[model samples]
Target: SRLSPIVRRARQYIQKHFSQSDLTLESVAEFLNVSPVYLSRMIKQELGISFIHLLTKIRMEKAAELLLSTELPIHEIAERVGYDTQHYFSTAFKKAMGVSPNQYRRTRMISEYTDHHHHHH
Candidate 1:
């Protein structure tokens, strides 16, 4: 399906504000000067995902980045990614990633280390 300019703007707005807990279809609709229902429909049609799912994806991507790059506790990382609680974050992360956040981090770390060592010799 062809994407609308409004949907593209909506995606940009979501990317810009996805870390805010208040981010939502309604809020983004307001930002785009459209009705919430209309924006939601366009997002589903053009992007093939719900606003919440896209926001969760963005959050998960950020969480993965922080997991690989920082030593912050999971709770702090969750909060930074807009989750209010670690349990909820872990559940969501597991759902999206097929592993819990800690496991995902450990697995990626080991993979990175293996790749780095292999490149050296």
Candidate 2:
């Protein structure tokens, strides 16, 4: 399910602070000035997924975009997107997208070059 406005705000808050290494449900709730339990239920009700799932979704989506658009290595990309471990990042990427980072990047490169050639013609 798509997120409602409040759930959207919660997601944005989570994405904004996820790189801090100390981000917590309590901090997010405190930032919103709501009870931790209330925020938790709001996220669950609105998104039909756990807040952590949403965070990982956001992270993985960003990782895919970077993989497609940049020449960054997996380890660097992992850190850029807040994953502390390259193995974890690559494992999650494969689980979510069914391809390794390098494979996805090669595909994207071919696709982009083809598109550019077609556009120039």
Candidate 3:
């Protein structure tokens, strides 16, 4: 089963430019040559989520990857994830992930350390 061409292109476009803080439904709709209302309906029907949901999911996933893999500062990570301010980024990340970005990084690092401890000979 395949998604409609527009829907597939929408996903690709978002994935590619999500780091740009100005990315928005209206802008994407314009680029896609579709109305925002129609795009919203297709996203909901085909992707089972809203445009913002898909955008945030991709941003947050990339954020988490950066948080875990690098020692970059919070604000740096925020900008990389398309957030204009660290405060805004932290709030959204906490709400979606149930932990602040730093907390997630520390907790995951600690677990990775434990996993390195070799449970048995």
Candidate 4:
């Protein structure tokens, strides 16, 4: 289902400030000038996910892009995704993707290389 207008705006705000260390339910709710309770409930109802889950999804998606497209170290990537601790980021990444970030990058790169080689041959 499509997100409601307020939830959609909340998503835009999350995308813009996702890298901020202080990005949290309270901060986001205040930023939107809405009560945290209402915002949280609306997100669940409209998006079918908790606020933190959505934020983590956004951060993880960005982290995956960086992992695949850049040579940045995992620590740097973690920092770029608003995770202050590399260990925590790695744990979260593994939980979300079923593999550690390093493993996911290596496996993806290997597959891409193989596919390109086959196409060229």
Candidate 5:
């Protein structure tokens, strides 16, 4: 759909901008060369979620990957992912995924180990 195509581009733009913690609706709209209201309406009309929520999901997904794959401490991980405060990162992660980053990593490790053993046995 034409609307979906536009929203997809918007999603890409959102991904590019979310690297800065200061990203705002106006900033994304400006970067995409669309008006804030129009972009917000288009996103809602096609995606049923606000642009900010989409950005949060993408950023948190990236953060979760880093948390699970790297040995970086919480503060370092937060900073690397554009979060200024570890507490804020943890709070956001929990709000997004229902688990803190550390818990998510531990759960992921356990799941992977169990899956490996289950397949072997």
Candidate 6:
């Protein structure tokens, strides 16, 4: 794969610690002992995404999962995804998802697994 080991490790570290409040690029870089500037550059070069972009993507994905699966309030949902403020979370979530969390939950259809049926007779 085109992914370098440095970016891969950083990606896993970000995924694992996403909900922690202080998971920053510098912290992860220090965790890997790689130069922050180099790590940041390679993350963009290798993944075509900035560190914060990747972090936000993971956070949003988890937010949507919790949104669908739990009746937790939006505030709690934001907290679970590491947002200190639901206001910002909602704004970002709305931007990323094209709808606010409440709207999203209200309009969600039944979840499905997409297992294929047999061939037609």
Residue range 18-72, candidate 1, lDDT tens digits: 7787788898888889999999999998888999999999999999999988878
TM-score of every candidate relative to the true structure? 0.86, 0.75, 0.89, 0.87, 0.79, 0.86
Give the Cα RMSD of candidate 5. 3.7
Q: What tens-digit string does per-residue lDDT give for candidate 5 at 1-121?
A: 5567668888877777667878778877777787889989999889889987888888898888878777778888787666889878888889999998888888884433444545655
Which stretches in model 3 have alpha-carbon errors above 4 Å?
110-121
Residue-wise lDDT of candidate 4 within 33-91, one digit each (tens)? 99999999999988889989999999999999999887789999999998998988999
Please give, for residues 66-97, the per-residue lDDT of candidate 2 as tens digits.
Answer: 88787778898888777888978888888878
What TM-score, to 2 decimals, does candidate 3 have? 0.89
Clashing pairs in 3: none
lDDT of 3 by residue, 1-121 (tens): 5999988988999999999999999898999999899999998899999999999989999999999878889999999999999988999899889999989987885434445755797
Using lDDT as the measure, which candidate wins? 3
- Stretches of candidate 5 exceeding 4 Å from the true structure: 1-5, 110-121
Clashes in each model (backbone N, CA, C under 3 Å)?
0, 0, 0, 0, 0, 0
Model 5 has an lDDT value of: 0.80
Model 6 scores what on Cα lDDT?
0.88
lDDT of 3: 0.91
Error of 2 at 121 (Å): 12
Give the CA lDDT, 0 to 100, for residue 22 in model 6: 80
Cα lDDT, model 3, residue 9: 88
Q: Output the worst ten-in-a-row residue range by lDDT, candidate 1.
A: 109-118
Q: Candidate 6, residues 17-116: lDDT per residue as tens digits? A: 8887688999999999989999999999999999998999999999999988877899998988878999889988998899999998989834456556
- Scanning candidate 4 in windows of ten residues, the lowest lDDT window is 109-118
RMSD of each: 3.2, 3.8, 2.8, 2.9, 3.7, 5.3
**lDDT sort, best first:** 3, 6, 4, 1, 5, 2
